[PDB]
């Protein structure tokens, strides 16, 4: 809430924030100029000026300085919360970055060298309990690395060389065996070091939404300044002109000091909330562009559900023995590394165990399976036992003597009707049938997708399968559309087609094949398991390897925009009560009949003006937690959200200023200051 | 009383939409660059003769065309008024105008404000009234409709840079919308008893014997385009109180219909050109709600009237002073609200003789930027600016990007919308400040107390907001007043037309998307209330202190 260990120093930072740093914010510069001129007027008025009671002008000057101090307190406190989060997570690499090798494969003579000037090309071996010097990927080996000092959980996570789980970060010391690390980039200009550098070396970097709202606030400041400065020639002829300090007090009470002082605090506090959600973002422009996206690109595996397919099914086809089908399956799977595949073949093993299948990898080679290859062929003695997908099997047996009966087509049609992932693995030109792979679609995903489809969020996903099973899974899951036959150029084409309609694209990629999509995507996040080629070529990264939190990323961005709009509406709506408190009080001598407009029956004109200034000063310190946290966000449609916001921030903004001015005036009357 | 007023409002706003729907379809046809049936051959022949054929110019050339035509008309009108003595058709041998008055009325007629600080029947000649004033009323109305044509074309056009042909638009508007309806309205005026003669001034042998001179002239030709284009520059000193201009209550009703005819038809045309009539329905609903509230408030104020009438002894306390007896206080209130919200400026009752709260609402209705059926196209693009502000606020308040009919409203559009909103309150406040601290500005008084400042504020508000309606107690024939009001009218027209054309140029370059599930609809009662609240808040938060020192102080006195 209010950590005193940072309030006590950032208050001094605010005290040093007053001179010449208010020039960037125009509303803050107007209230600063008004405070300075009113203070000078009171100083000259207590000594050698004709009008008396300079104590009222001094109190006005003091409260006009206090409201500037409170707005600077908001901005500095939110910026210091961002800096405190950055300093809390900056301890990943602080001392003894002195690990290197001699031989790139397995070197010796480990000594102390400065690693802050190393270009890409160096290979670093880390032993047990030693901090990783720089980001990169594993080349040889693999170990259970920990990420406790960088992420939230303190659970070690395994790594493998040559697989998808090949990424290391210079954070928590590794509690495992040896692991070589290839240096991705020179330390200092990586993603994490760059964001700590730009938080410590703070850049404002006004987003276009912030600039447009600032232009609106400047226009309001101009009309209020004109309507206030024109009051003196108006009221000079009608009697005695109003004092300048009353005019400056009314001008400060009129201009949107609330949202004007809380705009930068809202922006950097939304950024702080992003860093608190284990998501590290380059720009607040990207943070807000994550909000109001049309399509939401995911994949069927992991984001929807990891699946863990467990289904051993048979065929009533021309194949002779399902025992021989399982024999071919276990011949293909002797050192299977994929989890769903090894679970399927161990279900086949408990279905029908095989003798003499004692990991015979001496005479057999292994072909790794990737997203681009989709092939895992194993040669046992002289054959080519197949493991690929349906398109790959069509492609490679369409060349040499293969043919397709329609029976496998009705089999995969039945598999699609049931709802599964069809594997049609064979031996050669002989067709061995289909093995269905049932995946679970469990998890609280349909409720959040239903609450997101009210928000103008298309939820097209890239399944990487055939068009029938993907359609069935999408229909039972509840997403809008789907994409089958995953290919990076197809993903680029779909993203460019959606962006050609003026629709923003939100997506998630991990590998280096997704790097063009990370580049030419409007908003995109990348998990910690991704490589540097995708981490440095994307707008946003994910500190925790969970690609299902971009929905709360969208929620936080929309919270930022709704907070800006709600406090703008509050600042605009307060001016009605500011009129009802000041205008019948300002002209208490020029037009004595104007006291009928004092609907709150306040005590005295000076007390009324002072109470209005106290409320205008204290509304910022009362709206500190709303600006630091965000609005009470609920998943409603656009019209429902608009009417709920117009109710709350737009009826409170018309009601509670009256109550605040009345309570402050009553407290001043009870205390007897006036 | 209340039932009669409600029936009057109901039949006015019924016959208005009845007469404005087919004119709305016609103006939509002129927006969509489709010629009217049976007129394309003559149009092609006239364009080939004039050399005004298809050019399809962008926003910069459109703006330069409109400003060039308006400045050329200003120069011709100014020299015509300065040299009216040598011109023919002057039966009264009226002398040439002074430089300040001539410049003031030239800028007033050019900028569609039509502020008249002179007395027409003893100041301006038959040739001046018949030619220069009428063609400048036609040109100002055509320029306003051409600018709003450019804005609607920018809203309906996708990924282009052009905005049609400004000369083609001006000729089409003037020849197929302004002139024939003006013929119908003027011939109805001669049916009801207006003037369309060129006879000299007629001496009258009175029944008692006090000889009076009757002014004549081409009244109805000016009157028809004055009501159609919402111009407001009457023939005589009385804008529409004079019986040679508005002789019948039926004529007054026809005048009110002609005042609201073109903005309502342009709202219908905008709604039909977008392809969704709900947007025009939204605009008309917001304007009608504000209009009915203002009309009811002013009617109640004038029925309450002067409280001193029963004290001094009168049949009733209704404020019939400064109102013609051919029209009730209800009808005078309705005409006041119509011509002050619509940026017309014509008066059948002197607004100075109105009560404090009854003249409060015309002041606010000018000061809000004239968005309640204002002008001919000026009010429609002012309401477009307020709609852009409202959709920006709504987009922030729902957390989406600010968009309106598919087009995303960006930072440049916000800057130009803010500037166009800022121009006229700055003008009225600066001009009132200048006129409220000078001897020449404070020496044009007729009423003391807060009402004199109300007179000054009404004059500067009508100058800045292109209304031209006057309390007429202000002696605005001074050189300082003429120059200040001429500057106010010039900037109030051409510091608002320019950023609207820049907004149109920003609008053509973008592309409109479709309506999604999360896209907030820009129609319906929620957005109608949001737009009304935006207009009321913006027009109030600038002028509550000024009205508080003026009409509010006078009412509470």
């Amino acid at each position: 809430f209010e950590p005193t260990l940072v309030v006590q120093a950032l208050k001094e930072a605010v005290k040093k924030l007053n001179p010449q740093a208010q020039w960037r914010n125009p509303v803050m510069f107007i209230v600063w100029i008004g405070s300075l001129l009113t203070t000078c007027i009171s100083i000259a008025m207590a000594s050698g000026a004709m009008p008396g009671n300079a104590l009222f002008s001094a109190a006005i000057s003091g409260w006009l300085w206090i409201t500037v101090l409170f707005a600077n307190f908001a901005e500095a406190l939110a910026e210091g919360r961002s800096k405190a989060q950055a300093n809390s997570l900056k301890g990943v690499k602080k001392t003894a970055f002195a690990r290197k090798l001699r031989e790139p494969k397995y070197g010796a003579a480990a000594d102390k060298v400065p690693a802050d000037q190393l270009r890409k090309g160096d290979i670093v071996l880390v032993e047990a309990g030693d901090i990783i010097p720089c980001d990169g990927e594993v080349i040889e080996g693999g170990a259970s690395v920990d990420e406790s000092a960088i992420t939230g959980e303190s659970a070690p996570v395994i790594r493998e060389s040559g697989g998808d789980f090949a990424s290391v970060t210079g954070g928590t010391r590794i509690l495992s065996d040896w692991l070589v690390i290839e240096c991705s980039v020179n330390p200092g200009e990586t993603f994490l070091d760059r964001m700590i550098a730009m938080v410590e070396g703070a850049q404002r970097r006004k987003t276009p939404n912030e600039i447009a709202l600032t232009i609106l606030l400047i226009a309001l400041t101009i009309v209020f300044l004109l309507a206030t400065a024109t009051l003196w020639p108006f009221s000079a002829w009608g009697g005695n002109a109003v004092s300048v300090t009353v005019l400056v007090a009314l001008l400060v009470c009129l201009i949107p000091t609330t949202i004007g002082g809380l705009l930068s605090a809202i922006g950097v506090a939304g950024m702080s909330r992003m860093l608190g959600a284990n998501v590290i973002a380059t720009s607040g422009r990207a943070v807000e562009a994550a909000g109001d996206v049309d399509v939401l690109l995911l994949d069927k595996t992991g984001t929807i559900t990891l699946g863990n397919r467990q289904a051993s099914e048979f065929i009533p086809a021309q194949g002779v023995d399902e025992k021989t089908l399982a024999d071919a399956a276990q011949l293909a799977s002797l050192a299977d590394e994929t989890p769903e595949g090894r679970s399927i073949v161990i279900l086949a093993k408990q279905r029908f165990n095989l003798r003499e299948r004692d990991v015979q990898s001496l005479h057999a080679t292994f072909v790794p399976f990737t997203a681009q290859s989709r092939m895992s062929g194993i040669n046992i003695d002289n054959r080519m036992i197949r493991k690929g997908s349906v398109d790959a099997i069509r492609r490679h047996v369409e060349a040499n003597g293969g043919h397709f009966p329609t029976d496998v087509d009705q089999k995969v049609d039945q598999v699609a009707r049931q709802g599964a992932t069809p594997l049609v693995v064979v031996e050669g030109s002989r067709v061995l049938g289909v093995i269905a792979l049932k995946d679970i679609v469990k998890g609280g995903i349909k409720e959040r997708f239903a609450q997101l489809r009210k928000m103008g969020i298309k939820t097209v996903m890239i399944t990487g399968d055939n068009r029938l099973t993907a359609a069935a899974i999408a229909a039972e899951a509840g997403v809008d559309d789907f994409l089958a036959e995953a290919t990076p150029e197809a993903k680029l084409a779909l993203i460019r087609q959606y962006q050609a309609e003026g629709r923003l694209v939100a997506m998630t990629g991990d590998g280096t094949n997704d790097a063009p999509a990370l580049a030419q995507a409007d908003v995109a996040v990348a998990m910690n398991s991704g490589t540097q080629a995708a981490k440095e070529a994307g707008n946003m990264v994910d500190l925790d390897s969970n690609p299902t939190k971009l929905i709360e990323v969208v929620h936080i961005g929309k919270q930022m925009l709704m907070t800006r709009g709600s406090l703008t509406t509050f600042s605009i709506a307060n001016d009605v009560a500011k009129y009802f408190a000041i205008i019948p009080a300002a002209f208490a001598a020029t037009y004595p009949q104007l006291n009928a407009l004092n609907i709150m029956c306040l005590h005295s004109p000076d007390s009324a003006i002072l109470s209005a200034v106290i409320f205008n000063a204290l509304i910022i310190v009362f709206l500190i937690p709303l600006a630091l946290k965000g609005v009470s966000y609920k998943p409603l449609t656009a019209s429902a959200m608009l009417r709920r916001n117009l109710w709350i921030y737009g009826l409170g903004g018309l009601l509670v200023p009256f109550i605040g001015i009345k309570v402050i005036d009553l407290l001043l009357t009870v205390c007897g200051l006036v | 009383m209340a039932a009669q007023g409600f029936l009057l409002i109901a039949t006015f706003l019924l016959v208005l939409m009845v007469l404005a729907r087919p004119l709305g379809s016609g103006l939509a046809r002129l927006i969509n660059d489709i010629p009217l049936p049976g007129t394309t051959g003559v149009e092609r022949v006239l364009f080939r003769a004039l050399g005004v054929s298809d050019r399809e110019m962008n926003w910069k050339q459109y703006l330069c065309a409109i400003l060039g035509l308006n400045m050329l008309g200003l120069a011709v009108l100014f020299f015509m008024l300065l040299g009216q003595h040598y011109l023919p058709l002057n039966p009264q041998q009226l002398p040439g105008l002074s430089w300040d008055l001539a410049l003031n009325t030239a800028v007033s007629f050019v900028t569609n404000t039509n502020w008249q600080s002179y007395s027409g029947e003893t100041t301006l000649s038959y040739f001046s009234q018949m030619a220069g004033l009428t063609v400048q009323n036609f040109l100002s109305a055509a320029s306003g409709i051409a600018v709003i044509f450019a804005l609607i074309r920018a809203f309906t056009r996708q990924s282009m840079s052009t905005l049609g042909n400004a000369w083609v638009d001006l000729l089409r508007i003037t020849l197929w919308v302004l002139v024939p309806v003006a013929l119908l309205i003027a011939l109805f005026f001669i049916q009801q008893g207006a003037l369309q003669n060129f006879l000299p001034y007629q001496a009258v042998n009175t029944v008692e014997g006090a000889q009076q001179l009757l002014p004549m002239g081409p009244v109805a030709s000016q009157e028809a385009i004055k009501m159609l284009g919402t111009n407001g520059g009457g023939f005589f000193n009385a804008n529409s109180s004079h019986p040679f201009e508005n002789p019948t209550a039926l004529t007054n009703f026809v005048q009110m219909l002609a005042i609201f005819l073109i903005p309502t038809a342009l709202c219908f045309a905008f709604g039909e050109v977008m392809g969704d009539r709900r947007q025009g329905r939204m605009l008309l609903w917001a304007m009608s709600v504000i209009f009915v509230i203002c009309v009811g408030v002013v009617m109640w104020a004038e029925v309450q009237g002067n409280p001193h009438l029963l004290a001094l002894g009168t049949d009733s306390s209704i404020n019939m002073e400064g109102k013609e007896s051919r029209f009730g206080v209800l009808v005078s209130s309705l005409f006041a609200v119509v011509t002050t919200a619509a940026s017309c400026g014509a008066v059948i009752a002197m607004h100075d003789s109105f009560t404090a709260l009854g003249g409060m609402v015309p002041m606010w209705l000018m000061q809000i930027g004239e968005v309640v059926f204002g002008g001919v196209g000026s009010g429609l693009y002012g309401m477009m600016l307020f709609v852009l502000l409202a959709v920006f606020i709504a987009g922030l308040m729902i957390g989406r990007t600010p968009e309106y009919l598919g087009k995303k409203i960006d930072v440049r559009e916000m800057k130009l919308t803010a500037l166009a909103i800022l121009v006229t309150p700055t003008l009225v406040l600066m001009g009132a400040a200048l006129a409220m601290m000078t001897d020449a500005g404070r020496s044009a008084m007729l009423n003391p107390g807060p009402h004199g400042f109300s007179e000054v504020l009404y004059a500067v508000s009508s100058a800045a907001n292109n209304n031209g309606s006057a309390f007429a107690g202000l002696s605005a024939n001074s050189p300082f007043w003429n120059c200040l009001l001429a500057f106010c009218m010039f900037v109030g027209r051409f510091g608002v037309i320019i950023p609207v054309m820049a907004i149109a140029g920003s609008l053509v370059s973008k592309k409109s998307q479709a309506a999604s599930s999360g896209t907030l609809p820009t129609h319906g009662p929620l957005f109608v209330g949001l737009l009304i609240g935006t207009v009321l808040l913006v027009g109030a938060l600038t002028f509550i202190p000024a009205l508080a020192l003026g009409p509010v102080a006078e009412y509470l006195s």
Partner: peptide, 27 residues
């Protein structure tokens, strides 16, 4: 229009020019 009125007009004009420049160039 004494010296107080002159310096008030000058300060208000300076503030208006600063705000107009800020609106035109708002980064």
């Amino acid at each position: 229009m004494s010296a107080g009125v002159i310096t008030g007009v000058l300060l208000v004009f300076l503030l208006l020019g600063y705000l107009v420049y800020a609106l035109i160039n708002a980064e």
